[PDB]
Structure formats: structure tokens, C-alpha cells
Amino acid sequence: VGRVVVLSGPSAVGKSTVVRCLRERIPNLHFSVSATTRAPRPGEVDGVDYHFIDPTRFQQLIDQGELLEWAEIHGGLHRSGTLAQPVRAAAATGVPVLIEVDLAGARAIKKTMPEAVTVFLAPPSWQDLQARLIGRGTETADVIQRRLDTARIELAAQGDFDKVVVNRRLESACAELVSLLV
């Protein structure tokens, strides 16, 4: 059986370069391909970038328990979520699976698939994360204040996760995740 790992973290502790490292380091890693009810953009491939389905199908899948998690996107412009079947079929074939989702999606997946390992990718310190949120200072005080507030709420509940990987350095955070996946 392949391990299923669910990778989450703060709304912006930066996860896309970590994900890219992982897919580079594990040759046959299955990166979960989400279902969505929005339209393809040019260059998006059905089955690779998303499984493109229609609102009616999506509701059918919700009703039959075929989603590990789903959410309304942009206040309900459309819907996205993680399909259960590809994840289970890949693991049964022996391929390792990575699901990358926001904290609400990680929380939902632990209920629908308890044997998934949940990983919270933590910053090496508060000041490290705060520096990154202030960034180039091109946002207003109110926006920055909201980001810092959001970040502390999210940080406060990393305890709910099976594992905390501290992102001290790309290579060792990536190494820790490889060890979990294979």
C-alpha cells in the first residue's frame, strides 16, 4: 500500500516549491488531481490539472460520498474538492499520494480518510513568517494586520495534525516529507 500524505499549513507559509521538490524527488509520486466545476483555461488538461466536471455531477459526487473534501470557491462561483477513488486506487497500486489542501480541507480529509497522514508545514519562527507577510510593504496596515491575525489563528491549531514539519530549509523540509511518503 502507498502512503497518503495530506500537506497543509498557514494560508501563506509557501508550499508550492516544497511540492515541486517532492515531485522531483519521488519519480512516481501521485499528486492528487482535484475535481472542479470551473471551466478549463488553455493549456489545462482534464485528468492532469483538474478533473473538469459540471455542477450537476459535482452534486452527485457530494451526495454519494465520493469526495474526501470539497469547498465553495470564491463565495460559490464554483466548487473544488478531492475525489476519494483515485486516491484509494493509487495507494492500492502501491503508488504514494500527496494531497495539498488548505487547513479546512485537511481537517475534512481526516474524517473521511483517517489513515491519511496529515502534515502541518510550520514556519521556523513567528518572526520569520511575520517578515514574509510584511513583505515589500506594498499592502496597507489593515491588510497586513489581517494577515498576521489570520496567521496566528492558523498556527494555534497545528496540534490537530498528525505531524509538524518545520520549514527551516527547503532541502530538509523536503527530505522529511519524502521520508513520510516513501
Ligand X SMILES: Nc1nc2c(ncn2[C@@H]2O[C@@H](COP(=O)(O)O)[C@@H](O)[C@H]2O)c(=O)[nH]1
> Where do contacts with ligand X occur on this chain (CB under 6 A)?
34, 38, 69, 71, 73, 80-82, 101-102, 105
Would the annotation count 11 as a binding residue?
A: yes
Would the annotation count 141 as a binding residue?
A: no
Query: 69 vs 176, which CB is nearer to ligand X?
Result: 69
- Check: CB of residue 66 under 8 Å from CB of residue 51: no
Would the annotation count 15 as a binding residue?
A: yes
Would the annotation count 13 as a binding residue?
A: yes
Query: 14 vs 175, which CB is nearer to ligand X?
Result: 14
Query: 70 vs 180, which CB is nearer to ligand X?
Result: 70
Q: How far is the CB of 102 from ligand X (least distance, A)?
A: 5
User: Between the CA of residue 179 and those of 5, 33, 77, what are the distances in Å?
Assistant: 11, 22, 38
Q: Rounded to an integer, what distance in angstroms lies between the CA atom of residue 164 and that of residue 155? A: 11
Q: Rounded to an integer, what distance in angstroms lies between the CA atom of residue 98 and that of residue 23? A: 9
Q: Rounded to an integer, what distance in angstroms lies between the CA atom of residue 22 and that of residue 28? A: 10
Q: How far is the CB of 32 from ligand X (least distance, A)?
A: 7
Q: Among candidates 16, 9, 2, which has minimal Cα distance to 165? A: 9
Query: 59 vs 125, which CB is nearer to ligand X?
Result: 59
Q: Which three cell numbers stand for residue 161?
A: 495534525
Annotated binding-site residues for ATP read: 9-16
Annotated binding-site residues read: 9-16
